[PDB]
């Protein structure tokens, strides 16, 4: 009986009472950023084998124009206004 | 380094427990019973040089004093300061108690 009296007293005092879209948006954006960081780290892990061999320098490999155009497109750069086709060697 | 580390956990290689050492420090009667379960002529230094905290006999007073500066003795002191684990602490961990009327 004492336990039940304490229980109803706590229920009157709100001991068991249980309780923002901007916060939800900023949390979703942070989760997206963490996913992008994980993808970048996975790309680095795929590219690097520095225990056994050194990475070929970037200046010794000719980058493909299609890949450069695609990457600048995903970065949001208008490539037709700058004309990468004339810049590409043959 | 531990002598013969492979068989260190055997019951025939068991050492005195920390709560027993705590009771030895609190009560000289408990320590007296434990020392009665041994033979004095087979002990290092005829049993005259004893560290209660480490529950260990030593060959000489200088050996005991030199042992006190080492880290095993200081680890035993830190463990005794923290307090040995007992059945009372085990009961309090689950919130169980003894009703004696």
């Amino acid at each position: 009986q004492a336990l039940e009296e304490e229980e109803e007293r706590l229920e009157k005092e709100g001991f068991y009472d249980e309780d923002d879209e901007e916060e939800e948006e900023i949390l979703q954006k942070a989760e997206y950023i963490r996913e992008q960081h994980a993808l970048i780290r996975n790309e680095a892990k795929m590219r690097k084998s520095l225990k056994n061999r050194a990475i070929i320098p970037r200046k010794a490999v000719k980058k493909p124009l299609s890949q450069l155009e695609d990457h600048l497109d995903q970065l949001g750069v208008d490539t037709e206004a700058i004309g990468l086709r004339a810049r590409a060697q043959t | 380094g531990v002598f013969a580390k492979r068989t260190m956990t055997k019951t025939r290689r068991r050492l005195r427990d920390l709560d027993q050492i705590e009771r030895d420090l609190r009560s000289p009667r408990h320590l007296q019973q434990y020392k009665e379960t041994k033979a004095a002529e087979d002990l290092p230094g005829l049993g005259l040089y004893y560290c209660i905290e480490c529950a260990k006999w030593f060959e000489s007073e200088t050996s005991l004093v030199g042992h006190r500066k080492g880290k095993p003795h200081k680890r035993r002191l830190k463990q005794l300061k923290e307090g040995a684990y007992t059945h009372e602490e085990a009961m309090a961990a689950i919130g169980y108690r003894i009703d004696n009327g």
Binding site: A2, L3, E6, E7, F15, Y16, E23, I26, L27, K29, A30, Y32, I33, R34, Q36, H37, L39, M46, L72, D73, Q74, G76, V77, D78, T79, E80 | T9, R14, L15, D17, L18, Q20, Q79, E82, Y85, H87, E89, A90, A92, A93, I94, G95, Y96, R97, I98, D99, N100, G101
Partner: protein, 183 residues
């Protein structure tokens, strides 16, 4: 019969479970499993091993002071058997278990109160440092949206928002490498 509790970890010790160590001072040590038994024989302190009820009580992660915990005890003074007393005792145990569960959930929420504010602060810091990694439209997509807006007399910003919504809906992963065409 009765349910004991493990000396080392505090788990329920049902019959035929674990092992008992009989010490020569006259003290018995019941262990629920060989894990607890071997940690005891290695002289590990349960108060420092984080998976034990001893550690959790010492760290204050268990509900310790509470009225519902005063009903179970080791009764050293027996009571004469009474059928009505035993039945109302069973009803009491059921009610006490429900109340204890509710109070334990409240206790845990009080422990985990501040997580939302900490996570929001971390999210704001991460976004402020990495605004450039947020999703964006392609340059060719901006071209086609601009010319469609010019043709339809609509808002290019509006077409940008619904295109960003479609890109957020459609999630596509990138595959490493690529096939080399045979000669």
């Amino acid at each position: 019969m009765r349910i004991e509790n493990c000396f080392f970890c505090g788990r329920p010790a049902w019959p035929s479970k674990g092992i008992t160590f009989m010490r020569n001072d006259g003290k018995a040590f019941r262990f629920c499993r060989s894990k607890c038994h071997k940690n005891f024989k290695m002289k590990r302190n349960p108060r420092k091993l984080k998976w034990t009820k001893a550690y959790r009580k010492n760290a204050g992660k268990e509900m310790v002071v509470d009225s519902t915990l005063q009903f179970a005890a080791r009764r050293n003074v027996p009571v004469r058997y009474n059928r009505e007393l035993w039945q109302k005792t069973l009803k009491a145990m059921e009610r006490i278990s429900e109340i204890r569960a509710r109070r334990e959930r409240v206790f845990y929420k009080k422990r985990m109160a501040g997580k939302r504010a900490r996570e929001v602060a971390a999210a704001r810091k991460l976004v402020a440092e990495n605004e450039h990694l947020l999703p964006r439209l392609r340059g060719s997509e901006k071209r086609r949206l601009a010319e469609l807006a010019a043709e339809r007399g609509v808002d290019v910003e509006e077409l940008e928002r619904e295109e960003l919504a479609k890109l957020a809906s459609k999630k596509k992963s990138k595959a490493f490498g690529g096939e080399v065409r045979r000669v």
